[PDB]
Amino acid sequence: REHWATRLGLILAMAGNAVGLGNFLRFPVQAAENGGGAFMIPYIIAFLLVGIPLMWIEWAMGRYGGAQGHGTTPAIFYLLWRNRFAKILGVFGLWIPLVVAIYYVYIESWTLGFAIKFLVGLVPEPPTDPDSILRPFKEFLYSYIGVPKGDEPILKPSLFAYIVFLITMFINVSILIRGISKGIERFAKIAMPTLFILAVFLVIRVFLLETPNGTAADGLNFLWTPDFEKLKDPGVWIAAVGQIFFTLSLGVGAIITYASYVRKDQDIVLSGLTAATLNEKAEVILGGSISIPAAVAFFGVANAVAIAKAGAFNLGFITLPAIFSQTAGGTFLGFLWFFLLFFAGLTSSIAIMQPMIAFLEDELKLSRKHAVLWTAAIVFFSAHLVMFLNKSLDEMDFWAGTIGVVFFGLTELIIFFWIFGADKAWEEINRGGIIKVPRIYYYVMRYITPAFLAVLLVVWAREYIPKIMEETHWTVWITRFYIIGLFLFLTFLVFLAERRRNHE
Numbered sequence: 001r002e003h004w005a006t007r008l009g010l011i012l013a014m015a016g017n018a019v020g021l022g023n024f025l026r027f028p029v030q031a032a033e034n035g036g037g038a039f040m041i042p043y044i045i046a047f048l049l050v051g052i053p054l055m056w057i058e059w060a061m062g063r064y065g066g067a068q069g070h071g072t073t074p075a076i077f078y079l080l081w082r083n084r085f086a087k088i089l090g091v092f093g094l095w096i097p098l099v100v101a102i103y104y105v106y107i108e109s110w111t112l113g114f115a116i117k118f119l120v121g122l123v124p125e126p127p128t129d130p131d132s133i134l135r136p137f138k139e140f141l142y143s144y145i146g147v148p149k150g151d152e153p154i155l156k157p158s159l160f161a162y163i164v165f166l167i168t169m170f171i172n173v174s175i176l177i178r179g180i181s182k183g184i185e186r187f188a189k190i191a192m193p194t195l196f197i198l199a200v201f202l203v204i205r206v207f208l209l210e211t212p213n214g215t216a217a218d219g220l221n222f223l224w225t226p227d228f229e230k231l232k233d234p235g236v237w238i239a240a241v242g243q244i245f246f247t248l249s250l251g252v253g254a255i256i257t258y259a260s261y262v263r264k265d266q267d268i269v270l271s272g273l274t275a276a277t278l279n280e281k282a283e284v285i286l287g288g289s290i291s292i293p294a295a296v297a298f299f300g301v302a303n304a305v306a307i308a309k310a311g312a313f314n315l316g317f318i319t320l321p322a323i324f325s326q327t328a329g330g331t332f333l334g335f336l337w338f339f340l341l342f343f344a345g346l347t348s349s350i351a352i353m354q355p356m357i358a359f360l361e362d363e364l365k366l367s368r369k370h371a372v373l374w375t376a377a378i379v380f381f382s383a384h385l386v387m388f389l390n391k392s393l394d395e396m397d398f399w400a401g402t403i404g405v406v407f408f409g410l411t412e413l414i415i416f417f418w419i420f421g422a423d424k425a426w427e428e429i430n431r432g433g434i435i436k437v438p439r440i441y442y443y444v445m446r447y448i449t450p451a452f453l454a455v456l457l458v459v460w461a462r463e464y465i466p467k468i469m470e471e472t473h474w475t476v477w478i479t480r481f482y483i484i485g486l487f488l489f490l491t492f493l494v495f496l497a498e499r500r501r502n503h504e
């Protein structure tokens, strides 16, 4: 079986998986919509009681399975619990990263697309007023994506947006087809430093920003001013736990597969803890010091609220681009911005596709070349539903990316720490550990963490699913139909995998 060459590589790869567009976009927005500085209370609490606990578990499971030639949950779940229902539940852990990938690479292709357009200075040029500046860029984005102009839920991406998507896929293939060490690990060692560098620069530059409407200091101030009255709101503790789950890429299956290439006795406690720490610093320190400070510096705190409610997407692809077109060398700044995000996405998309690759290699005995190519094929084809059908992206992101990950996280906890055996799991976690997990996490993982994930799934599902299932256009069934098919497909492959094992 393949393995990570170095300890630095492993950590950087794992960290690259967790660091994404969310670090520089979603976090700042959430933190602002949930009490600024006060949001650090439920955020930190969730990181210690959910993020870290679950993270180690996925490392543990991943490594556990890797020692037996299995890097995916259909087999790993079976190993932790020899029951056919464990194989079916394991399929769900392979379905999620596949579906997510189907829409994520495309999203990533956007950043590469914009980075290019900005680099070469092919962008809108206002003109005065905010609406006047924003509209040109709002339309710049809409033209790229192909936002519907009619009542038909049809998207029509630009030829350029399509071609860039092909290139993005090609870049992912190039890295993946070289394997774990010479491909993923190798690229991580370059991407992370480049990422960190680009972030730092952007941080410095933003702090210099001064307009009649305000400064970067105003933005940071607003963002970090604690509103201790919002902590009462349960919806805040839900946004916090959700933000941690998101930023750590938990329940997505990526971590398990990466961890399956960790040697039988190679530490996962310190390695995992460090990987997480890296992501956190990139999120709060860097991510919180760019987008929002910039938006507030340019539009004044008078719109800090509105802009925050406008969403992370608008913030990263519309508002900031517009801000850049009004600052000195802003166009080359936009480049660095989207360049930053592209590497943020890339280090995740390669991780989000490895699971499907690992399955083909481990269970169907496909060469790495064939596995990667077929995986690229499946995702590339499937992506066309996301590119051309409006709101398909949202549907996949919901069931798989959102619902799926929280449900699966709870499943992991229970199978590992309850079915498999708490003590067995605990030793399975601490074994080979450079450092040992504080004896207190035993109870956290066994009761506290599952309890949390349950409340999150439940309290949140009550005020979520009803909408999607009722207040949506009928075309959502196209997407639901397709992704359900993918689940069937994967269930079939698993069937074929277990039949092959019996034959040999």
Ligand SMILES: CCCCCCCCO[C@@H]1O[C@H](CO)[C@@H](O)[C@H](O)[C@H]1O
Residues within 6 Å of the ligand: 146, 156, 157, 158, 159, 160, 162, 381, 384
């Ligand atoms: C089925 C797998 C192969 C892809 C089938 C071709 C569909 C892609 O269609 C492409 O869409 C782009 C974006 O709207 C357009 O700009 C291009 O003109 C068009 O060729």
Ligand SMILES: CCCCCCCCO[C@@H]1O[C@H](CO)[C@@H](O)[C@H](O)[C@H]1O
Residues within 6 Å of the ligand: 159, 160, 163, 164
């Ligand atoms: C590598 C990324 C740049 C290459 C992609 C360029 C393709 C988009 O090029 C576009 O093609 C359209 C259809 O022919 C024309 O109508 C547009 O004028 C032209 O800009």
Ligand SMILES: CCCCCCCCO[C@@H]1O[C@H](CO)[C@@H](O)[C@H](O)[C@H]1O
Residues within 6 Å of the ligand: 116, 120, 122, 123, 158, 160
């Ligand atoms: C030099 C390598 C990169 C070439 C950049 C090609 C991408 C340009 O893309 C072009 O942008 C124009 C203005 O936004 C649009 O009007 C065209 O429809 C679009 O194809």
Ligand SMILES: N[C@@H](Cc1c[nH]c2ccccc12)C(=O)O
Residues within 6 Å of the ligand: 017, 018, 019, 020, 021, 022, 023, 100, 104, 245, 246, 247, 248, 249, 250, 252, 348, 349, 352
């Ligand atoms: N970790 C990503 C979010 C994320 C969660 N699961 C994923 C799966 C694939 C890609 C990204 C993700 C971020 O910080 O923004």
Ligand SMILES: N[C@@H](Cc1c[nH]c2ccccc12)C(=O)O
Residues within 6 Å of the ligand: 242, 243, 245, 246, 397, 398, 401, 402, 405
């Ligand atoms: N669905 C969320 C993003 C997301 C994906 N997976 C998640 C897990 C937890 C919280 C949020 C997410 C959004 O619309 O932005």
Ligand SMILES: N[C@@H](Cc1c[nH]c2ccccc12)C(=O)O
Residues within 6 Å of the ligand: 263, 264, 265, 266, 267, 431, 432, 433, 434
């Ligand atoms: N468990 C120790 C020693 C060890 C066992 N197997 C390893 C494989 C690689 C590196 C170290 C090890 C560690 O992770 O450091």
Ligand code: NA
Residues within 6 Å of the ligand: 018, 019, 020, 022, 023, 246, 247, 248, 279, 283
């Ligand atoms: Na992150």
Ligand code: NA
Residues within 6 Å of the ligand: 015, 016, 017, 018, 019, 020, 343, 344, 345, 346, 347, 348, 349
């Ligand atoms: Na990444």
